[PDB]
Amino acid sequence: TSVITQACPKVSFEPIPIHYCAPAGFAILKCNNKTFNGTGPCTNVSTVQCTHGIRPVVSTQLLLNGSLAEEEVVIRSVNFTDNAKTIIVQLNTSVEINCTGAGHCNISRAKWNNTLKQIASKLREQFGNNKTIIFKQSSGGDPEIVTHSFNCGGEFFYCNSTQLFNSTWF
Amino acid sequence: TENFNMWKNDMVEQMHEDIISLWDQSLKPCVKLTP
Amino acid sequence: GSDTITLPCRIKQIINMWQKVGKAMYAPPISGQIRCSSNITGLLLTRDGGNSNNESEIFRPGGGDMRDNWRSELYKYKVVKIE
């Protein structure tokens, strides 16, 4: 049970947009379908030397500082049927979450309630014609899983999000 | 054209290992892992 | 008027690692003005079960597999062998 005592240092972690180009005798094929949805035969596609400016942000339940959908909210999952599988959601418009070491994160109430009904306009049923969509919060598990954990200014934040995922829609 | 893509990779496994190896060189702690 | 969703937050020093199954401890803060401004660009959810195809569907926040974080950016890409 390996323990390692390194000179634990107070550094500042900053994200450098990472570009991933073609690896050796291989070629990167970007699908240009504005609304490509996961698995499937991409129609419009083209070879590229490198992907794009990818910002490697480590965090939970909320993907941040990344790529948005240019058309509508697009969701993706390996199997929308198996409840055990993660469902990723690509948003239409960015939302802001301002945080400080003082223990809080505030995000606009209106901006976020709107994205919720948008995401609600297509959940599991599969853009289902209609049914009741409910947003509750984590059942349990690790702190990093149960809360929006992320690395802010070098420090590790564990933001309680019950208020973001506790509502009902149709 | 007319190609296939999916919930597999490109750089998912690659990137993951780059980022894991990036964090290590940057945010150094006082680790404890179980073998 | 200017109703903002205030979320209680906490800075922990002992954390469960995301890299591999481990635990780590970092030094406490030194700055008195840790300030971040991020743009939520997405969401990673999960759905309650045992109610397949019925009237309601519960969705809770998720995450954990950082791969699912790279997947959101790399979805539209693929590596093909070239001669």
From Swiss-Prot, chain C:
Residues 52-62, 54-62 are annotated as: V5. It is a peripheral membrane protein; Single-pass type I membrane protein. It is found in: Virion membrane; Host cell membrane; Host endosome membrane. Glycans are attached at N39, N54. Attaches the virus to the host lymphoid cell by binding to the primary receptor CD4. This interaction induces a structural rearrangement creating a high affinity binding site for a chemokine coreceptor like CXCR4 and/or CCR5. Acts as a ligand for CD209/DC-SIGN and CLEC4M/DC-SIGNR, which are respectively found on dendritic cells (DCs), and on endothelial cells of liver sinusoids and lymph node sinuses. These interactions allow capture of viral particles at mucosal surfaces by these cells and subsequent transmission to permissive cells. The mature envelope protein (Env) consists of a homotrimer of non-covalently associated gp120-gp41 heterodimers. The resulting complex protrudes from the virus surface as a spike. There seems to be as few as 10 spikes on the average virion. Interacts with host CD4, CCR5 and CXCR4. Gp120 also interacts with the C-type lectins CD209/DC-SIGN and CLEC4M/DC-SIGNR (collectively referred to as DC-SIGN(R)). Gp120 and gp41 interact with GalCer. This is Surface protein gp120. The lineage of its organism: Viruses, Riboviria, Pararnavirae, Artverviricota, Revtraviricetes.
